[PDB]
Every structure is written in C-alpha cells, then in structure tokens.
Design a protein around this ligand. Sequence first.
Ligand SMILES: C[C@]12CCC(=O)C[C@@H]1CC[C@@H]1[C@@H]2CC[C@]2(C)[C@@H](O)CC[C@@H]12
Length: 242
Amino acid sequence: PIFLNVLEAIEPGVVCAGHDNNQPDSFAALLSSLNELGERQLVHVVKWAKALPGFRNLHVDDQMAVIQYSWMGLMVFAMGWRSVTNVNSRMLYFAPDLVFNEYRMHKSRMYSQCVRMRHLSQEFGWLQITPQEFLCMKALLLFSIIPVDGLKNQKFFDELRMNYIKELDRIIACSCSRRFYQLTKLLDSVQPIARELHQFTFDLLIKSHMVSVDFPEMMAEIISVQVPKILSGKVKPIYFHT
Ligand SMILES: C[C@]12CCC(=O)C[C@@H]1CC[C@@H]1[C@@H]2CC[C@]2(C)[C@@H](O)CC[C@@H]12
C-alpha cells in the first residue's frame, strides 16, 4: 500500500497557536491567535503538499497556486478531524492551546461559521470515516480549487486529481458506491464552509487595524491577493455533485 504509506508518513504533527489562555477571551485576542495559527499551519501545509505523490509534476507556479487556493479547506478539514479525535463536538480543536467552546465561538464573532465547522466534525463521527479515508480525502482537497482560466499546466493537474480520486476509490473498495457517494458529498461540503471563512477573513483583514486584530505578513498577503480571486469567482471549487 505505497500510496497510503506515503500519506501516513507525511501527515503533519501538532501545531500550537501560542495563545494566552490565562487571559479573558477577547475577539481581538482569539482572532489574532487564530491568524497566528493559520500562519504556522501554512508552513506545515506547504511542506506536506510538496511531499505528496506526484505534486512535483506540477509547474512551480501551479504548485504555489493550488496551495494558496486550498489552504483554508485543508486546514478546516484537518481541524474537524482533530475535533472528533480529541474533544466532543460541541468543541472545535484548533490547537492544544486553542480549543473553542460555545462561549468562544460567540466571542470570536464567528458563531455561524463555527456551527458549520462543527457539523463537519460531527459528520466524520456519523459517517465513521476511517483515518485512511480521512488522509486520502485531505489529499484530494488540495486539488479541488482552480482558476476558471486554467492553471499553467492544467493537463498535469487533471491527471494528478484523477489519480487521487482513484486512490480514494481503492481505499473504499478494499454499497462501495454508497460509500464513495457519501465521501464525495462530504468533500463537497467543505467548500461552502471555506467560502464563508474566506469572506470572514477578507472582511476582517479590511477592518483589521480598527479592531486590533494582527495578521502575520504571509496571511495578509494571501488574503489580499489570492482570497479575493475566489470571492470574485475567478477561482472556483471543483464539486463532485451539482
Ligand atoms: C485556518 C484557521 C487556522 C487553522 C485551523 O485549525 C482552522 C482555522 C479556521 C478558521 C481560520 C483560521 C486561520 C485564521 C482565520 C482565516 C481568521 O482570519 C478567520 C477564520 C480563521
């Protein structure tokens, strides 16, 4: 099981937000901590993606683009997994030092987005997603959002994505169609969540200095240059179902 060996081997370890849990929960503090967490996880996502089977087959520019478009979906998917794994789904396990209870979901001003993420977390439970289904789905997520004008080498991308789909199907196969159906619906359900988070972070970046939220430099760059391409519809998710 070469493919599965790789995905398991490359899976990132624990990442902390560096949040001060001893201090009363403010909007500014919670959101600055989520931003810092995002920046730290982006480093890990980049090294993960580069080690994925076939990833180096893409043009350098497509490598960068797929990561910049997909990171929100990928991080949310992993966060959902951690959440089923560690806590119990009233809660969102962003990091060991950054666990959201309902009170925090409210103070972050992200309550409804958090409700969507928790629904995702719960779905992993209800579908009884295996660790190996999780790993293959996460890999697929990196190849599920592209510019409508195409990538530099769209042909290699379409081939990469096909191969990850085949890998998910094998992991299922090893009825079957019911399971593939359910997993593809679950993958699709990540995309509305990512879209609402993209809107939210974009708004927050615009009004950031007003509300005293810090955006690390890499975060501010991607949210101002790449996230607006998704919100304006220049970059769109690939859905399995209509
Ligand atoms: C990806 C992160 C951070 C990593 C993670 O575990 C999931 C989580 C989802 C909410 C994101 C956050 C990064 C910072 C964002 C983008 C904030 O600006 C608003 C929503 C936050």
